[PDB]
Amino acid sequence: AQRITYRRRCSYNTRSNKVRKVKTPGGRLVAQYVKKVVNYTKCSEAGCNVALNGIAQVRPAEYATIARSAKTVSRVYGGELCHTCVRSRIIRAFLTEEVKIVKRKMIS
Amino acid sequence: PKEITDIKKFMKLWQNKKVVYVKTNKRITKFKLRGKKYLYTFKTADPKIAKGIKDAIPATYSKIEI
Amino acid sequence: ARAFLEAKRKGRHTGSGKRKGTRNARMPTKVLWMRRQRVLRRLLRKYRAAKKIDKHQYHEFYLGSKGNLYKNKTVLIEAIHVSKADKIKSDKLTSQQEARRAKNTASRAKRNEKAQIVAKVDV
Amino acid sequence: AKFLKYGRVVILLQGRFAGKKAVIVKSSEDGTKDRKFGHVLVAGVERSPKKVTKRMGSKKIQKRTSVKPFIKYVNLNHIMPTRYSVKELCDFKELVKEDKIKNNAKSEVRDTLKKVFVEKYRTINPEEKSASHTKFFFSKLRF
RNA sequence: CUCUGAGGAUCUCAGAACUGAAGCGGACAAAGGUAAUCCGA
RNA sequence: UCCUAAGACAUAGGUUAACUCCUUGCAAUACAAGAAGACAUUCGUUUUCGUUGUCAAAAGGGAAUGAGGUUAAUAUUCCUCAAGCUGGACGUGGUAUAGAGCGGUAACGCAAAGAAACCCGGAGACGUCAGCAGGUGUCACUGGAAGAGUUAUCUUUUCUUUUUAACAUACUAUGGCCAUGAAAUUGGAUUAUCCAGAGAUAUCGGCUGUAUGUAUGGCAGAGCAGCUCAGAGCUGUCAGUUGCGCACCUGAUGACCCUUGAAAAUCUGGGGGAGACAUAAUUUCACGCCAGUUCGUACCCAUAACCGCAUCAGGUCUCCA
Ligand SMILES: [Mg+2]
Ligand SMILES: [Mg+2]
Ligand SMILES: [Mg+2]
Ligand SMILES: [Mg+2]
Ligand SMILES: [Mg+2]
Ligand SMILES: [Mg+2]
Ligand SMILES: [Mg+2]
Ligand SMILES: [Mg+2]
Ligand SMILES: [Mg+2]
Ligand SMILES: [Mg+2]
Ligand SMILES: [Mg+2]
Ligand SMILES: [Mg+2]
Ligand SMILES: [Mg+2]
Ligand SMILES: [Mg+2]
Ligand SMILES: [Mg+2]
Ligand SMILES: [Mg+2]
Ligand SMILES: [Mg+2]
Ligand SMILES: [Mg+2]
Ligand SMILES: [Mg+2]
Ligand SMILES: [Mg+2]
Ligand SMILES: [Mg+2]
Ligand SMILES: [Zn+2]
Which nucleotides of E are covered by protein (CB under 7 A)? Predict the structure, then answer.
């Protein structure tokens, strides 16, 4: 049974301090420091809270390292909104202007 | 370390201080290019691709065998 | 260690005098249940996929196993054979009608039990 | 009750083209062996003409006017059927070629339309009931 | 200790028989009860 | 070291004989306090936007590294080998445009595909408990090979080794979406809940998200185990199975509150299209060139390196089993 040693001078077990046991070519079982998981990207509209598709879930840093693709999608709000919200936006805007004009002609 | 399946890209890389490292294993052979940020390996099974690639070693690149 | 596991597998060393923990402690009920449920549902799925059962039968049987009506997988099987054999229409019956249905079902059963015998002889 | 007609302006809802305006060239109730669902063939403004000042210059005012059209097939369900209609702006039956579309000629139709639209837009006649609509066709929608 | 049956996939449970200085949670581990009275819930 | 917290202190203003004292992030009991750009490139000129500070975390947030080897004493630091990150600056190829990629009905896709003010986002960014599922490590078992223990008797025996780092490419992964079609003899589904005409189930359907997964590269050349030779040499490191087992991590849930569980720096996306530009202009593609400063890294962390007048039966916060 192999036992491990923290490698960092932080002996306290903290979400940021997690460790994983790796088996080396040497035959050693070594602590390797595991990173933290992050929350998936959600659509930004009010009360929506939908998981966006086609965007990478990545720790904030690695976001500078990835390809344009993972940072984005091809819609009108590709990154910020989901389709449903896009759609409802379109529709709402169009119909609202229609009612606007109608009120305009009814005023003139 | 990257590995290459298609000889073409490999040959574009060794055509691009250049030395080539070839090493023998029982069932396979490997050809190895050193480049700034990557070590390129190329494996083949059959002797044909083998000899053909040994042929492919240019005057610019020197061949080391382990 | 191995020799003991041997005898334990032959069943020589398990007894009441050898048991320190609760029945529930050794193996928790919940596991036994999950295992049974999972078995029953895997079965109902094989059957509903093979057309042997229909969505109504599936549902009724699913809620059947949810209700601990079937101890065995063998028993769920027997009761599926029953839903198939008995017409699933058991509603609005006069006792004359149910007597008749009973005897029709008994006849069927006997019949097929007979065939299931004869086919093993010739093979 | 049905309005699918050649010349009706519709908005695309979801798609890379979502949010854009376009006109119905053709409508296939149930579609081809190729597209087995209800769809419409459409020609629309991909990039709209940018705003033009009364203070700009010649080259400015001309460049500003550039339009980039697109021709797309869209499931009717992805469409918002605008009540605005422009039938006469061009002959789309003529310029939209089933051939050219399937034939790897896409860019050709592109050019043709670019030409047509750009021409029409500066040529917009202010008294045309056709024009009140035309403007809206080249209009930019706000989400 | 010697057998028997039941629960599952592409380890639990129950029966019977035989055998010992009637012993067998054999170490380890591991509540003594009951009925009243007074306080404080 | 940077960031913010509970907090704290200047500055400004006021109080005191005076010392001292009172306010300040939701920043002021204050307030003619700032930042940026460009040309200039000093000033100056000029333009734009603007109310005003700092310190407090060696368990919180937090750009990127690993395996092997080495010393008498250091090593994720040195050596060897293999990687990544940020900031520079051009070189060579390549994307895009006479305005600014292409494909799919759609989810979405693809080395790359123009831009300022301005306004909004995402991640960072989070409680406790309960059970379910998966992965890693460990433990167990199976055939093969090398070594070792036992051998009066028995034992095709008993033990041992049988390893794979970060990182690269491709695939799979508990969820969510998109079509097509709509469900009553209602169905679907979990251990548990729970979902559906506000579109369930279902299709040789499709898209997408997470590996402590698989394959190959790394890589065997290393490590490990044996056997020789007199520092060199040779051989093998192979192929399977299962677990309500255990520790950790992840995934999808559930329960709970007169409790409801930080913030900032940092990385990134969207809406907008004022400007810039023909020998031109601008662009999250490849491959190449340059740099990474300062301080801490020994050793004890306790029935003898700490505090208990001590080499004291006391006391003193964690991880691996
Ligand atoms: Mg390097
Ligand atoms: Mg238990
Ligand atoms: Mg018994
Ligand atoms: Mg007896
Ligand atoms: Mg006793
Ligand atoms: Mg007593
Ligand atoms: Mg009390
Ligand atoms: Mg504060
Ligand atoms: Mg204060
Ligand atoms: Mg770091
Ligand atoms: Mg180094
Ligand atoms: Mg760089
Ligand atoms: Mg929570
Ligand atoms: Mg073995
Ligand atoms: Mg799926
Ligand atoms: Mg070797
Ligand atoms: Mg488990
Ligand atoms: Mg613990
Ligand atoms: Mg909450
Ligand atoms: Mg934009
Ligand atoms: Mg002491
Ligand atoms: Zn949304």
Answer: 1-14, 24-26
Resolution (A): 3.5
Say whether the D–A interface has 3 or more Cβ pairs within 8 Å.
yes
Half-sphere exposure of A6 (CA within 13 A, CB side): 9
How are the residues of chain B apportioned to helix, strand and coil, as percentages rounded to the nearest 5? 25, 35, 35
Q: Phi first, then psi: what are they for B57, rounded to 5°?
A: -70, 110
Determine the nucleotide nearest to C30 by Cα–C1' distance. F191
C34 Cβ partners below 8 Å, 6+ apart?
Answer: none
Q: Are D38 and D29 in contact (CB under 8 A)?
A: yes
Give the distance from CA B29 to its chain's centroid. Answer: 9
Nucleotide nearest to B32 (CA to C1'): F217
A91 contacts in chain D (CB < 8 Å): 13, 80
Strands of the D21-28 sheet, one edge to the other: D68-75, D39-47, D21-28, D9-12, D79-80
